[PDB]
C-alpha cells in the first residue's frame, strides 16, 4: 500500500505548477489549485516543478508513481491498457511501453517492483539554476482516464517522492485526470464542487 500522505520532510520538498496566463497558456494541461488536481491531455508534455528548501544528500532521486484514488481500486497497479501498451505509436524504442507515467529527463529510469508489480519512473534530484526557486521536469501520461481495460474511468493520483538510497525523504501528490479537454473538465469539476 503506497502512501499518498503529503510530507515536506526535513529538506522541505515541495511541488508546484507554474502560472498560466491567457496569452501564452498551453491548452494541453491545467492545474486546479482548489481541487489539487491536474487535468492533462494524453501523451503531451506537462511541466511539473520541484524544489527542496535544503539540499538533500548527494544522489537523491525523485520518483513519480501513479496510484488509484478510491479504496475500491487502491490495490490495483496503475498501468497502460493493453491496446496502447502494444501499439507501435508512441512506443518505438521506449524501454517501458506499459508504464502510464513517463518523464523526459535524460536519465529517467523506469522500474517495476518484482513482487507488487508497481511501476514508477525515477530521475535525479537537481539543484535549481542560478536565481531559480524551482526545477521544472516534463512528464507525460500515456493513457486516457477512460481507457477501457486500463484506467477505465477510475480516478488516479500521482505520488512524487524525494528519495535517497531507498529512503523516502519527502512526498507530495496531486490527482490527475487525463482527458481530451483539460480546461473543460477543470471548469466542470470546479463547478460541481
Ligand atoms: Zn490506453
Numbering used by the authors: 4 to 196
Q: What do the authors report?
A:
Low intrinsic stability is a crucial factor for the susceptibility of the transcription factor p53 to inactivating mutations in human cancer. To gain further insights into the evolutionary history of p53 and factors that govern the stability of p53 family proteins, we have characterized the DBD of a p53 homolog from the extremophilic annelid Alvinella pompejana, which lives in tubes at the edge of hydrothermal vents at the bottom of the Pacific. We show that it has a p53/p63-like DBD that is more thermostable than all vertebrate p53 DBDs tested so far, but, intriguingly, not as stable as human p63. In addition, the A. pompejana homolog shares DNA-binding properties with human p53 family DBDs, despite its evolutionary distance, consistent with a potential role in maintaining genome integrity.
We determined the crystal structure of the A. pompejana DBD at 1.92 Å resolution. The overall structure consists of an immunoglobulin-like β-sandwich, which serves as a scaffold for an extended DNA-binding surface. The latter is formed by a loop-sheet-helix motif and two large loops that are held together by zinc coordination. The zinc-binding site (Cys176, His179, Cys238, and Cys242) is conserved in A. pompejana. Key DNA-contact residues are also conserved: Arg248 in Loop L3 for minor groove binding, Arg273, which interacts with the phosphate backbone, and Arg280 in the C-terminal helix that interacts with guanine in the major groove in human p53-DNA complexes. Structural differences were found mainly on the surface and in loop regions, for example in the L1 loop, which plays a unique role in DNA recognition by human p53. In A. pompejana, there is much less divergence in this loop, apart from a one-residue insertion at its N-terminal base. However, the overall conformation differs significantly from that seen in human p53, adopting a much more recessed orientation, with a high degree of disorder observed in most chains of the asymmetric unit. Intriguingly, A. pompejana has a similar large-to-small substitution at this position, F270V, but in this case, the crystal structure of the DBD shows that the substitution is compensated for by a small-to-large substitution of a neighboring residue, I255F, which maintains optimal packing of the hydrophobic core. The additional tryptophan-mediated hydrophobic packing interactions are likely to contribute to the increased thermostability of the A. pompejana DBD, and also that of the p63/p73 DBD, which is supported by mutagenesis studies on human p53.
